[PDB]
Amino acid sequence: SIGTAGVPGAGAIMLAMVLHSVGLPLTDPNVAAAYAMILGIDAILDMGATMVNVTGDLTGTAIVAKTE
Amino acid sequence: IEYPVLQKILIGLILGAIVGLILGHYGYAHAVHTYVKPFGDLFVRLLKMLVMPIVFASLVVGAASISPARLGRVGVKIVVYYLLTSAFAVTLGIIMARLFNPGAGIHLAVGGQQAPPLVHILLDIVPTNPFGALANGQVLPTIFFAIILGIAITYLMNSENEKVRKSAETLLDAINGLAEAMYKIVNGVMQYAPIGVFALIAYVMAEQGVHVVGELAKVTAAVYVGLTLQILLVYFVLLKIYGIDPISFIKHAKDAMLTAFVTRSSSGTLPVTMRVAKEMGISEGIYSFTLPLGATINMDGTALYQGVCTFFIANALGSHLTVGQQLTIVLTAVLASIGTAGVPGAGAIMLAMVLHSVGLPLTDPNVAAAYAMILGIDAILDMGATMVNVTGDLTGTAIVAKTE
Amino acid sequence: IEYPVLQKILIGLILGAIVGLILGHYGYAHAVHTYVKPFGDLFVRLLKMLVMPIVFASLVVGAASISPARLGRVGVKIVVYYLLTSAFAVTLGIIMARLFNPGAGIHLAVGGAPPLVHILLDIVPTNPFGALANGQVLPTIFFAIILGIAITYLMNSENEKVRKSAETLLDAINGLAEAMYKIVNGVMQYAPIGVFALIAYVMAEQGVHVVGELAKVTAAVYVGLTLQILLVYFVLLKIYGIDPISFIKHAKDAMLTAFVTRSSSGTLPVTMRVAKEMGISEGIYSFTLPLGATINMDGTALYQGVCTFFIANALGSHLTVGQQLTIVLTAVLASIGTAGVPGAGAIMLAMVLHSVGLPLTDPNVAAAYAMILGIDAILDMGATMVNVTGDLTGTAIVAKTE
Amino acid sequence: IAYVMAEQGVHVVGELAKVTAAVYVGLTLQILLVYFVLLKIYGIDPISFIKHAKDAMLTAFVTRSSSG
């Protein structure tokens, strides 16, 4: 998901989706266990990730703007 | 179709456990499941098959025993039997859950900090159609009917009419024809038991053995040696104290325990469980009413597994667990489903249900996390708990029997 | 409540076929369905009723026969029996599907999962009482065999309460088993009404369709199986003593029910009673007529040989002539078992298309398939009747061996 | 009409094609004999009409959707 990373909680979704690809499916009750720990911390890890995204959005704007 | 007896089972068990534990470590746990599992099932299939006739039929006949007492007594005794075994099992679990301390690697604490009617389950005992009862599974209403039928047959034989006294015999004999017929099959099955046992704890060791590692393994220690201590210190102490020879007991009860461990199903082993009580030499008037009412009333297993697992979680979310107030939660767990502990995987369910009561709901993604670890080890923790239940079932039978 | 015997059936059949085929041509096919059908059902009803007791009961008693062989043998034989009849049925269908060429008027060309082990484990019921209750032939089969073998062993018990009760049960069960054969004739007295009413409707609601290129599949079925009876079964009855015309004599009623009930298993009461009155022992026919009804492929092999052609040739394809078999064999082998249900033939035919690569979505695949579905009942009658003829043939030959 | 000819062209064969004939020339005859007869009879020049309406017809035929 190059695109559509804007929605809150999205990070957790891909993290799960990767496990489908890794070959460790979320059924395996210890895969699901560790994943659940991340889910008990995702909101904290989401705040920082979005704030650094919107800092990166303006940085990208102000640099391209000060060109074209 | 020949060869050595119940060492053939022990050849399957040890050889399976090894070949499965190996095969799942190298990841083929799924491939083991698609190739091995179905021979392990075909064993449990054939055993299940019998469970309905072999109980129903045996217990109509088992009401040929003296009805007012025997089925009025013993029931009173075998109830009070499980009270005083489950009491010991609780304190043996708690004192195993402190001994081993499963809550060190996690260590990962999350805050928090924070419906059965019975009467509408009591009225369920009494079926409203005994034919359906039998048909659609159901052990504990079929129990009630069979007892009420065989008592009624007893009373028909004492009828001054002799067409009545006549037919009365016909039915009861024909029913014992079945009852017996099934014990015949139970050995026919047993000849497939080494294949069954090999294939079952091959898979169950592949798909949940690898998990028995680290802090997870520290619960499996306090279960497996915790129940090993229930056998030796509580049951043999009761067998010794009631005549019946402890080692001669394991001799006879070998096959019922090796099936209970591998089938992981209390009720699903009752054919074998009962045949061991025949060949042990108890009368049908007891074992036909104490081995099924055992499989569904026995708490020795769940009291010992949700004693050490209740700790693991309370201690993994980094809590005091009110040491010595463990019991408050462990007792209330058992008592929430005194009955209906026979189904496989039931232990996990109550463990979850307790958390609803503790105040830590399964939503809290770290509650759910720790619980999920137990769920990756439940099958291993289930085998031992059922095997120690069906050992406790026969121990209860052979002691009450050698009284009344 | 009296009158002539099984000519009364043949009076119903011919008189019904005519009155129905007539009545549906003039469109009252629906009205026939709301007035005639329910007397045709009441026949299949009463027959169905028996199927469970009459099989279960008969086969506990049929394990009074010598268990290690007989139920260990024959099973080996009757399996290998159907192998060598279905083989002949396949090549009799393909060589009927070339002979008649059903794919000329269309001519309209468009481009273009079973585990087994989790069906093998289904043979063993987990509750025999339920098994019986909730239909189910092939797990009831397995129980009854296992019971009657167990009873056998109880009689050789040194105890004589045991040896006692053992008898009681087995006798009481044979009481039932027998009781049911008694009813099977009670039913048969309603068989002329049942037959008349059934192929009255089935000829009204699907007879009119047996016309044109559709009729050119009905030819290669009906004469294709007529040739299975004469050239494959009689050749096997002749070659194993048992007299071919004395066989049809005795098996008259089981074939006329199989044709009209269109249900293999739904005729087993009559099918079995013909094997009693024929004189085979329960130790054989109680295990080869039900394991026949569900393992027999003579019908589906001959109907999805000529219907497989019709579709492949109606979408204007080569059909890899002489490589018909690749598809026809794979069809049979996809449901070796469980061919007993009525309408089953249509299902596999569809399922084959999933494998051929022409899915039922392609609105001309679905078009040709829908024509077969407007004729399936006529093609089903003949296929079942030749199955239950093949069932008794298999029985009477294996029986007159072991 | 690459796809629409792949997925339903092959079918335009035999008795099915005999409906496609009576449609396609049946409407070709609606254009010429009914519409041009009305365009002729109301001034507006028939061939100058197709000139202008070229693109609306080649979209209607391919989009297969009146309103679209």
Residue numbers in the entry:
A (entry chain E): 349 to 416
B (entry chain C): 8 to 121, 127 to 416
C (entry chain A): 8 to 119, 127 to 416
D (entry chain D): 213 to 280
Show passages lifted from the paper.
Glutamate transporters, or excitatory amino acid transporters (EAATs), reside in the plasma membranes of glial cells and neurons, where they catalyze the re-uptake of the neurotransmitters glutamate and aspartate (L-asp). Key mechanistic and structural insights into this family of transporters come from studies on an archaeal homologue from Pyrococcus horikoshii, GltPh, which symports L-asp together with three Na+ ions; however, it shows no dependence on counter-transport of K+ under the conditions tested. GltPh, like EAATs, is a homo-trimer. Each protomer consists of a central scaffolding trimerization domain and a peripheral transport domain containing the substrate and ion binding sites.
